[PDB]
Amino acid sequence: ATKPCQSDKDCKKFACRKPKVPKCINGFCKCVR
What we know:
Structural class: mainly beta
Number of strands: 2
Radius of gyration: 9 Å
Order of helices and strands: EE
Largest sheet: 2 strands, antiparallel
Strand order of the largest sheet: 1-2
Distance between the termini: 15 Å
């Protein structure tokens, strides 16, 4: 299960309260659905 992360290669699986998809890009991290 790969979530679109800045560098998914070296990004580590993390989950959050809904919205449950934490997209980290350009140092920014927040949760979308």
